[PDB]
Amino acid sequence: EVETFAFQAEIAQLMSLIINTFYSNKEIFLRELISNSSDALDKIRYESLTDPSKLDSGKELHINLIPNKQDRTLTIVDTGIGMTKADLINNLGTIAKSGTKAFMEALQAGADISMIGQFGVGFYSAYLVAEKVTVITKHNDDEQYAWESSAGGSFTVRTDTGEPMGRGTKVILHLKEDQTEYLEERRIKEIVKKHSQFIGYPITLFVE
Numbered sequence: 056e057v058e059t060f061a062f063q064a065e066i067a068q069l070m071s072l073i074i075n076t077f078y079s080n081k082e083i084f085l086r087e088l089i090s091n092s093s094d095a096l097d098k099i100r101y102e103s104l105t106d107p108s109k110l111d112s113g114k115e116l117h118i119n120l121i122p123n124k125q126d127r128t129l130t131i132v133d134t135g136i137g138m139t140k141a142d143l144i145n146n147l148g149t150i151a152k153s154g155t156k157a158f159m160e161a162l163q164a165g166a167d168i169s170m171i172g173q174f175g176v177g178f179y180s181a182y183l184v185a186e187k188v189t190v191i192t193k194h195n196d197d198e199q200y201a202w203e204s205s206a207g208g209s210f211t212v213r214t215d216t217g218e219p220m221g222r223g224t225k226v227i228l229h230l231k232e233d234q235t236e237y238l239e240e241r242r243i244k245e246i247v248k249k250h251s252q253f254i255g256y257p258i259t260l261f262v263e
């Protein structure tokens with residue numbers, strides 16, 4: 056059973072802007088997704104301080120970067136708080152409508168697409184490099200779900216029966232044909248070192 060949802064008009068507009076605007080500095084997508092994973096890991100860390108049982112679903116707090124050249128996917132995995140079905144539908148736990156407005160207002164005042172994260176809608180920078188994004192998530196208070204969107208105004212949500220992950224979020228980027236440099240080990244290393252060198256969690260770049 057797959058449920059299909061319309062993106063709110065502002066998010067559809069934001070995604071269209073990310074996909075259609077000429078902007079060469081696409082590598083910032085990885086900084087934005089690692090930043091989101093870091094935020095999710097801080098959240099479960101903070102909740103665990105008063106309720107250590109919240110780590111029964113996994114004590115390790117980390118971020119894994121998984122390139123797959125055969126599938127042309129770059130997956131960002133974290134063992135953060137995860138998202139409920141409600142969080143997923145509500146723009147992946149973001150204030151995407153007000154955030155999109157503030158980002159638009161910022162762009163008019165001299166900002167560029169790299170500042171997207173400041174407005175809490177950094178997730179959508181995934182569409183700088185991906186034609187489709189799949190989000191597999193598991194929060195302690197809910198079931199495992201898969202969110203997916205190829206943009207075009209809609210997203211789907213379904214239960215995810217395969218590969219139980221325990222807790223956290225997996226962001227699967229189905230890369231555009233001309234964005235395969237983000238599958239290269241030296242390119243991923245370079246971006247992590249440039250933009251995410253002081254993240255407070257281990258970032259493991261998997262090899263093939």
Ligand SMILES: O=C(c1cccc(O)c1)c1ccc(O)cc1O
Binds near residue numbers: 092098147226
């Ligand atoms: O699961 C989250 C998340 C992030 C911040 C707060 C929260 O309640 C959930 C998440 C959201 C986006 C992403 O790219 C990675 C993630 O782990």
